[PDB]
Amino acid sequence: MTYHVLVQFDVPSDKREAFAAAGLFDANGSLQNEPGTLRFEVIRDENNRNRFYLDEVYEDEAAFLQHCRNETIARFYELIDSYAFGPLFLFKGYRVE
Amino acid sequence: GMTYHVLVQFDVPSDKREAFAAAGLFDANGSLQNEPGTLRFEVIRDENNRNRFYLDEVYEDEAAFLQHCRNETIARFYELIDSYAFGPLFLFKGYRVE
Amino acid sequence: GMTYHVLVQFDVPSDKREAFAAAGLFDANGSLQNEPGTLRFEVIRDENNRNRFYLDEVYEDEAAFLQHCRNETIARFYELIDSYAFGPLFLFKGYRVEG
Amino acid sequence: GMTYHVLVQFDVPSDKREAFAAAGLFDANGSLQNEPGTLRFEVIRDENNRNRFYLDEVYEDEAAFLQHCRNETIARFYELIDSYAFGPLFLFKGYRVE
Amino acid sequence: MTYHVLVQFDVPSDKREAFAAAGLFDANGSLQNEPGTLRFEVIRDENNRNRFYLDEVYEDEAAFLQHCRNETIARFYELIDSYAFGPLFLFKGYRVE
Amino acid sequence: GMTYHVLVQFDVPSDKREAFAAAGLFDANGSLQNEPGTLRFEVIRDENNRNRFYLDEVYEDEAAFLQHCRNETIARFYELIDSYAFGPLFLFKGYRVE
């Protein structure tokens, strides 16, 4: 029963590259340093150039709660706090079989 | 690489939960076993909402998603759920940032 | 000038698709034939979700919409759908932008 | 007949309300003047949220909508709003009943 | 200082009275037996007769987490599990005083 | 008894979080002190999204809410936030079940 978390962010038009870099920093840092993290993808909406999505998967819920208290997500929020709208959690869920 | 991502949402009546879960798993396995362009297909149930499910799909490109929409696995899937399910609601379609 | 737009959303069970379409067409035809301030009333079905419908309504002004909300057609429309339909969900109310 | 309906939503900063309204009106006028398959194109402002706009578009079929997405008018429209607008968010695509 | 949680449910048309009684049971039992539960309101949508909301207020986030673990909410879900759609959490947040 | 409840949502830029909170507090306090039909008015910050706020409003009935919409407190509130805020988005309005 993996734990899935889908997050959504909106950023101003002049901060598209800035957020993409911060999102990729969150992804690579979480994958390189947190054993509970199985997948971390950064996705851009196909039509809305200001809207991004984070598709995250963890071993269980405890691994996500650990991620929320680790250093990588703290630096990610330090990078984007001055412009980004979000997070909006589209869902949290468990994988079916 | 720059993969194509599709996120879908469904709601079902309370008495159809594992019926939908079974239908989604047949869709996932049939798609993976028959569609080289379909790269991922996960069935997810909301952690709190008992009646809500999500489908996390990844494709080679947009053309592979369109092919999936015309293949017979998806057609069987809708024949299973059409009498009770609410959806699909497409949360998003998008491209992976590398 | 500056017409009033109302977009409404409904969901129905799979076995009530024909019933709601008939009720929605009753609301549209009854409103367009009996209410002078009603300029347009369309029934639309989602291209992928066969259980979801939208009502695209346009009125003379806001006052014409308030009148429609108090008239006989909308009351009978809700009588026809109450036993099965989910809604309404108002997507928006707004004003036409003019040059 | 069975027309094809597209509803789109945009948000803009408080100081860009007139800029987007002019851009949407150009999109509407240019589409009506040049696209026979484009049957309607209205620009609507939310009654309470002055930063939110909607585009109510009608086409004779889905092919006509796809041609509109490829034509010059929408390309110029997106050049105008790219520096500030949030969107598009597609509220729905659907087919007229009767 | 208070912690606010807004919840949304949908029910079939023939279950409106049943859900109202279940929601009232949840509210009264929670308010009477949970000191951290300060306010708990059952609200019906003005237009959508099938849609209900729960407006809950707690002393802090820990009081809400304990509420989720207690017996009143478990009995609430036993009453509604056979028909209700939800819960959909509209938001959770903190009051600005 | 059957009070009337109104839930509202706003988004503001990252540098206007304190300005909007002060404006919402002015709206809340001015309305509660001066409008007998206004029974409750709460400003709520989202627990995760620092740019998103909500207003939880309770009234005697729908007439009392409509009167609030026509009064001076809300008019000054919108003057304070017009240059930056996104909204209002009315989540719902409804009646308390007793």
Side-chain angles (χ1 to χ4, degrees), chain E residues 39-82:
Chain E
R39 194 174 80 216
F40 206 112
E41 288 175 337
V42 183
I43 303 160
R44 185 144 68 132
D45 193 88
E46 65 179 356
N47 303 305
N48 188 346
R49 289 173 260 280
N50 285 0
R51 180 153 286 184
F52 290 73
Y53 315 96
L54 308 182
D55 196 339
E56 332 179 344
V57 184
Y58 301 90
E59 232 166 28
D60 51 31
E61 187 185 350
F64 169 64
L65 301 175
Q66 188 55 61
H67 168 82
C68 291
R69 291 154 153 90
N70 286 337
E71 271 158 52
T72 299
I73 191 173
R75 186 49 178 160
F76 169 73
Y77 278 118
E78 289 182 356
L79 291 174
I80 71 171
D81 186 62
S82 68

Side-chain angles (χ1 to χ4, degrees), chain B residues 4 6 8 10 23-24 26-42 55-78 90:
Chain B
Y4 191 64
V6 181
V8 194
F10 284 91
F26 271 131
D27 194 2
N29 297 341
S31 296
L32 284 168
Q33 289 192 240
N34 303 299
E35 300 173 350
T38 301
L39 303 184
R40 194 168 75 216
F41 204 111
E42 295 162 339
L55 307 179
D56 195 323
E57 322 175 3
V58 187
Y59 297 94
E60 197 140 278
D61 48 32
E62 184 206 80
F65 170 62
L66 296 174
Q67 193 60 60
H68 165 90
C69 288
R70 311 194 279 238
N71 285 337
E72 97 160 301
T73 293
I74 191 165
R76 299 299 88 85
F77 170 79
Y78 277 112
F90 287 87

Side-chain angles (χ1 to χ4, degrees), chain C residues 1-17 19-71 73-97 99:
Chain C
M2 257 153 228
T3 64
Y4 191 75
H5 293 244
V6 180
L7 262 286
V8 199
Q9 182 181 280
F10 285 90
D11 288 333
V12 301
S14 69
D15 72 324
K16 302 286 199 233
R17 298 168 183 162
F20 181 89
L25 289 172
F26 159 80
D27 194 1
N29 289 325
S31 296
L32 290 164
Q33 261 159 42
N34 295 295
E35 305 176 343
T38 305
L39 309 187
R40 160 172 102 222
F41 207 114
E42 299 171 332
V43 184
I44 307 161
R45 186 209 110 230
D46 190 89
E47 100 179 325
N48 298 117
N49 183 351
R50 304 168 128 151
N51 284 357
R52 180 159 285 187
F53 292 79
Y54 313 104
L55 308 181
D56 192 325
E57 323 172 2
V58 177
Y59 299 88
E60 209 158 40
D61 42 30
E62 191 199 340
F65 174 60
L66 300 182
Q67 173 92 51
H68 164 90
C69 287
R70 297 177 343 231
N71 284 347
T73 307
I74 188 174
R76 178 56 180 172
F77 162 76
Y78 278 114
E79 278 180 35
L80 292 169
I81 67 167
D82 188 61
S83 67
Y84 59 86
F86 286 88
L89 178 292
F90 285 90
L91 294 180
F92 63 79
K93 309 182 271 183
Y95 292 103
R96 179 97 146 261
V97 165

